[PDB]
A paper describes a structure:
Although the cryo-EM structure of the PAO1 filament achieved near-atomic resolution for the inner core of the filament, the resolution of the outer domains was substantially lower, prohibiting even the tracing of the main chain of the D2 and D3 domains. Thus, we expressed and purified the fragment of FliC between residues 178–395 that forms the D2 and D3 domains and crystallized both the native protein and its selenomethionine derivative in the P2 space group with 2 molecules in the asymmetric unit. Employing multi-wavelength anomalous dispersion (MAD) phasing methods, we arrived at a 1.47 Å resolution structure revealing the D2 and D3 domains as a contiguous barrel-like structure composed predominantly of β-strands, with D3 positioned directly above D2 along the filament axis towards the distal end of the filament. While D3 in S. Typhimurium is inserted into D2 and they form two separated domains, a different topology of the secondary structural elements in PAO1 FliC results in the D2 and D3 domains folding into a single bilobal structure with two distinct surfaces, the concave surface facing the filament core, and the convex surface exposed to the outside. Starting from the N-terminus, the first β-strand is incorporated into the D3 moiety, before the backbone turns downward, forming one half of D2. The sequence between 243 and 353 is entirely a part of D3, after which the polypeptide chain returns to complete the fold of D2. On the concave side of the D2/D3 domain, residues between 233 and 242 belong to the β4-strand that occupies central position spanning both D2 and D3 and together with strands 7, 8, 10 and 11 of D3 and strand 13 of D2 they form an antiparallel β-sheet. The consequence of this organization is the tight packing of D2 and D3 which are oriented along the filament, instead of projecting away from it as in the S. Typhimurium. Compared to the previously determined structure of the type A PAK FliC, our type B PAO1 FliC outer domains are oriented similarly relative to the inner core.
The flagellar filament, a tubular structure composed of thousands of copies of the protein flagellin (FliC in many bacteria), exhibits helical symmetry in its straight non-motile forms and is supercoiled with a three-dimensional waveform in motile bacteria. Flagellar filaments can be neatly divided structurally into the two highly conserved inner domains, D0 and D1, which form the inner core of the filament, and a diverse number of outer domains, which decorate the inner core. Here we show that in the Pseudomonas aeruginosa PAO1 strain, a bacterium that forms a ridged filament with a dimerization of its flagellin outer domains, motility is categorically dependent on these flagellin outer domains. Moreover, a comprehensive network of intermolecular interactions connecting the inner domains to the outer domains, the outer domains to one another, and the outer domains back to the inner domain filament core, is required for motility.
Residue numbers in the entry: 180 to 378
Write the structure that this text describes.
Amino acid sequence: GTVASVAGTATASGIASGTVNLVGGGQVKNIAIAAGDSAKAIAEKMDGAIPNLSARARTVFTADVSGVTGGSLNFDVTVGSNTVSLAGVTSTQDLADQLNSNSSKLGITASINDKGVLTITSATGENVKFGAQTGTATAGQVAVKVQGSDGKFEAAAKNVVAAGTAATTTIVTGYVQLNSPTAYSVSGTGTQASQVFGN
């Protein structure tokens, strides 16, 4: 078991260019992965690429705001091609509320429960990118745990926004979930495929 290093987590640069080699049902197919591709785009390319292969994409993560002091957090959020500016965020509830106010523009669901767990979904698998911290806070972070194709959330969080020293892993790429009644393999040179699928 190795998990993907880009899909299903937050990274600095998102998906790297590469080629995915698919073999199954006696067919061989090569799929171009473009730099910055979303799970949505990758799934669109892979779905039905060989017979019976299903590919679905979703970007789902929990987000927690912690340690905000000296002011409040301001930062942009981009989902796919749509961007909004959040400001005055000091708690997870604040984040939830502002994501919800912007939910139509962003094409997301942002659901926070009474235990403070905020789950954010791009149902089709668009990338979610966090902008630089431009608010007054002198400390504080937004940290995320992303869901994988196995339905499990990361147990360890990564900062996507931080006051003071900037977060580095700001791009959440969703998962690509493959299913098939028949055997198939996915591979690539180096990490070109495993950045999406693990090994």
